[PDB]
Amino acid sequence: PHRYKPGTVALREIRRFQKSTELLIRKLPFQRLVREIAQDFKTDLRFQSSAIGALQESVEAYLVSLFEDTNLAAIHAKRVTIQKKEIKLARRLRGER
């Protein structure tokens, strides 16, 4: 049988996604979420199409921006695994609470 040492396909993935630029969260599920979130403000709200996109491109940009920082908080603790505690610090330093 063939087995790729752990962390090898992962790196295949990193190289992969940094080369492309398509959104990475499923469209509808996302739309759903937005809608849900919005409902809590104004009911019966119609969303222009692109408003979901500008919304999604936005969030994804952020989460990726945030992940890089998170990954730096990892390598810092002399590790290579992003832990819930990195995000805390990562967000804590970009200043977000």
Binding site: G7, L11, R15, Q18, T21, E57, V64, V80
Partner: protein
């Protein structure tokens, strides 16, 4: 002859002058200001366009698309700073994989 022409600019000096007026920035708007700005705005547009194409060029392509723009930007000390808190839709991220995440122990040639 148009002010754009009367200045060597391809950008609408006329426009910019108006925008500035119906824009609420000052009571009055110096006559030369709109010129000076249209020039500054043209310059930048070209600067990025230059670096943008180059990215397309390097990728064997002829049509500048967002990744190119986003690449031109994140790789230019100047632009990446002027556009630090701006997000390019469909831009991607400069390819980069931290060393601590790479494989091995010295297996190069000697």
């Amino acid at each position: 002859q148009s002010r754009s022409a009367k200045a060597g600019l391809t950008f609408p000096v006329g426009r910019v002058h108006r925008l500035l007026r119906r824009g609420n920035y000052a009571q009055r708007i110096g006559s030369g200001a709109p010129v000076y700005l249209t020039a500054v705005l043209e310059y930048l547009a070209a600067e990025i366009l230059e670096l943008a194409g180059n990215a397309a060029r390097d990728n064997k392509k002829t049509r500048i698309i967002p990744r190119h723009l986003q690449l031109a930007i994140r790789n230019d000390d100047e632009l990446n700073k002027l556009l630090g808190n701006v997000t390019i839709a469909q831009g991607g991220v400069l390819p980069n994989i931290h060393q601590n995440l790479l494989p091995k122990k010295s297996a190069k040639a000697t």
